[PDB]
Design a protein around this nucleic acid. Structure first.
Lengths: 60, 99, 92
RNA sequence: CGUACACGGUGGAUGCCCUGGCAGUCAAGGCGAUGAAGGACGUGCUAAUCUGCGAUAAGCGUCGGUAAGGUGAUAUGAACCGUUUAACCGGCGAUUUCCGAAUGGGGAACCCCGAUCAUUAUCCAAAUGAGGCGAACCGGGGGAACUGAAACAUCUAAGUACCCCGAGGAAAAGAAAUCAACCGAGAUUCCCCCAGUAGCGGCGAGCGAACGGGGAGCAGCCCGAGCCUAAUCAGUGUGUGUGUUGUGGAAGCGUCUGGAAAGGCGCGCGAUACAGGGUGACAGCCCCGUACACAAUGCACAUGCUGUAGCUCGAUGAGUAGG
RNA sequence: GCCUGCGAAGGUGUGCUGUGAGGCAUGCUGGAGGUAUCAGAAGUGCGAAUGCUGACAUAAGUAACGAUAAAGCGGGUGAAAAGCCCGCUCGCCGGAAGACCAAGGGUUCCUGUCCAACGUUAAUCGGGGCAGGGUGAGUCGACCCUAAGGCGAGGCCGAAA
């Protein structure tokens, strides 16, 4: 997701997204448990996403 | 200057007459062209110099002095490959003096 | 939700627990106070949380001669069980 | 075991090179309780350092420039991103946990609140100020000694070192009850000269101006009343001369040596552009760059303009002059 | 106004010339630049401050390792074992080399793999090097308060930390 997408989303959409990404921000945490499908791309990307939307939320 | 997106033509080395594209350019001045390779032990198509030893660099180690890109003079060389989105570079490419 | 926690556990030590005795081990970040480890677990772990205890820890500089030793380790917490289900799986 | 030398070593001089210093010059010039400077401690898959940031942590967003290569110095392994045009460069915006001059209080960074002084005061801190930092320079005060006088109490070093308080980017001074060659000059500083003269001094050693002249820079005005409006004040609009990056940018030539020339030798060229560096060995004509060109920002000092708004009359400051 | 990778400066050895201070040449090496004339220049030409700094020789392969004076005999492992391990025998210490702790030090603890470096010998040993693991309390300690005493605020003193 890019800043352009988040700005287009509504106040509720950003909330459901932050929450969806929040719920999303759970699935991962399994490497130390011995996982594989865990991707390093979104590891760092997701934290930025929930943040990007968090920044625009205040910009509004 | 020399770029990686260009084709070179040998003129001195035992690979004289071979054609190919520039693999990569090192800050050493040497240039490895797609073609000038060597036959390793287990016969693996990998460019490298001819000398005994353990671990040594790849590339056949060609020199810009014996190569042939766009030399403004009378030679035996012929056509050579060369960006376009620049626009201004297209004018020079169109001129029989530069590229 | 899963935002502050590392490896579930290890062999004989964090395994002696969770067996039949309502208790669970799980590493977690250091910046984790008491707010989480009750709001990252218990949420989807399919269980409500037991006497909850969220520990924290950190070492200190030194250890060597001239360098950047300054550090701050990270700290798991003991989460026994409210009487219900053992995180759905991991256990006896 | 004496001495010289030979081969090898120890050692590290020397020769050459050097991403460093030293020095000069031009430009530019403040930061913060919208809590800075500094420090502490985090942050990159691995990173121990440095740097960049700081928990959206060597990064996020917008515009413009730029460009295909990129993911800081380390050219590693793994691996990612980029044409939904990144990296990189410039400006700006968003965000910016906790502690932290923070001032609620205590405290070697940890826990609870506008502390203290002061003004206004609806006396409710309700509305405000001070309390910090910063290379030197500047202003107002306090004020030595060793030393020199080849002793030393004047004198000299000092009105310096150091100390206290404070402003600005600049300060201090200043419009003359002055100067005084003159029917004259004529606000005040600063530079040069006048003087090392006048003057001071166990007149011993030493100490030491000014008027004037030649320059730089030039501006004069305000405190009782009468009257009326273009000093002043309040506010508005808002510059010419720019800052960084990218675009318009010619150019391996020949022979010989060599792994390679930025060699030797031969020839030619740039110049309102005759710095330097890079490129496999001393290339101003290989690449960047130097003169040059263009676009993004900051400053925009000024000016213009609105409402205020001239001008006129008299006087002019005593515990001062002076002793 | 000349020399140079048909090779220079420098260095080593050697020849020649000058009264000399030196110049110059050859061979080896070096292998990048280096001079002569006239002229100006420099922080200019040096063995002799209990000189300053670094390096080095002779001295020396000389001096030294001493009340808790205990090791020895077999065996095991190993390429090597007089001091790693096993058994036996022989002893030391007992307010003490025993046990539990404060301060302080600080991971030095444990396991595995090794040893180039450390252990005044060697080491397959280690409190050594590398990689992991270990210190899970409401009732232990910190946290809290207070004594001698100290600090900040108001009051009062050229001024003030």
């Amino acid at each position: 997701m890019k800043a352009k997408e988040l700005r287009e989303k509504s106040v509720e959409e950003l909330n459901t997204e932050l929450l969806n990404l929040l719920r999303e921000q759970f699935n991962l945490r399994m490497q130390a448990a011995s996982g594989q499908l865990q991707q390093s791309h979104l590891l760092k990307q997701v934290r930025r996403d929930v943040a990007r939307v968090k920044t625009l939320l205040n910009e509004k | 200057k020399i770029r990686r997106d260009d084709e070179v033509i040998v003129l001195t080395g035992k690979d004289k007459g071979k054609r190919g594209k520039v693999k990569n350019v090192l800050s050493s001045g040497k240039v490895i062209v797609e073609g000038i390779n060597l036959v390793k032990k287990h016969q693996k198509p990998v460019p490298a110099l001819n000398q005994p030893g353990g671990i040594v660099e790849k590339e056949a180690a060609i020199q810009v002095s014996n190569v042939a890109i766009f030399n403004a003079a009378t030679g035996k060389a012929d056509r050579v490959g060369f960006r376009f989105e620049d626009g201004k570079k297209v004018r020079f490419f169109k001129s029989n003096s530069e590229t | 939700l899963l935002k502050v926690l590392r490896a579930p556990h290890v062999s004989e030590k964090a395994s002696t627990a969770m067996e039949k005795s309502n208790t669970i081990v799980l590493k977690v970040a250091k910046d984790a106070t008491k707010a989480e480890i009750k709001a990252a677990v218990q949420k989807l772990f399919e269980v409500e949380v037991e006497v909850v205890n969220t520990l924290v820890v950190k070492g200190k500089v030194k250890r060597h001669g001239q360098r950047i030793g300054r550090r701050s380790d990270w700290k798991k917490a003991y989460v026994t069980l409210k009487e219900g289900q053992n995180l759905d799986f991991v256990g006896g």
